[PDB]
């Protein structure tokens with residue numbers, strides 16, 4: 001019955017506190033406050049079952065975390081705009097990991113917490129270390145460097161861009177993929 005469906009797997013990766021779990025809650029429940037959640041979606045006249053995997057709570061557990069990777073069809077690789085360190089960790093931690101366990105899987109680079117670009121309090125905290133909220137050109141530059149399938153920005157808190165994050169991800173998951 002569900003054996004007639006197209007089944008695909010999405011995994012969300014990124015630093016602790018960068019908004020992975022809130023992003024998935026807003027996708028699944030439509031409200032800003034995980035699981036493995038299966039979302040049923042109709043795409044091009046066909047029923048799709050998208051399984052959603054959160055790596056939150058496993059960022060420090062190097063032997064457990066990669067047990068989320070088998071059979072993955074698309075990766076959401078997240079960083080948060082309130083944290084340049086989370087962006088630097090993309091090429092130096094997350095990409096190496098995902099390329100090793102999920103070779104030839106499309107990677108979408110996702111800037112989370114977009115709304116914090118206009119938070120006075122974040123800006124003041126980051127101004128102490130001579131930093132600023134991660135800007136679009138920087139996230140965009142990172143995506144070209146890691147050869148991402150796409151670069152998208154969202155805010156789980158305002159819901160902006162969340163739909164398109166997962167719509168793009170689902171299209172990437174459904175893309176034909178040859179070799180490993």
Ligand SMILES: Nc1nc2c(ncn2[C@@H]2O[C@H](COP(=O)(O)OP(=O)(O)O)[C@@H](O)[C@H]2O)c(=O)[nH]1
Pocket residue numbers: 014015016017018019020021022023056057112113114115116154155156157158
């Ligand atoms: N302002 C803002 N805060 C967010 C957003 N998404 C998550 N947060 C907050 O950032 C913190 C970490 O979010 P969480 O989803 O738990 O991060 P995770 O560790 O990567 O799963 C929490 O306090 C969230 O409430 C967002 O879009 N905007």
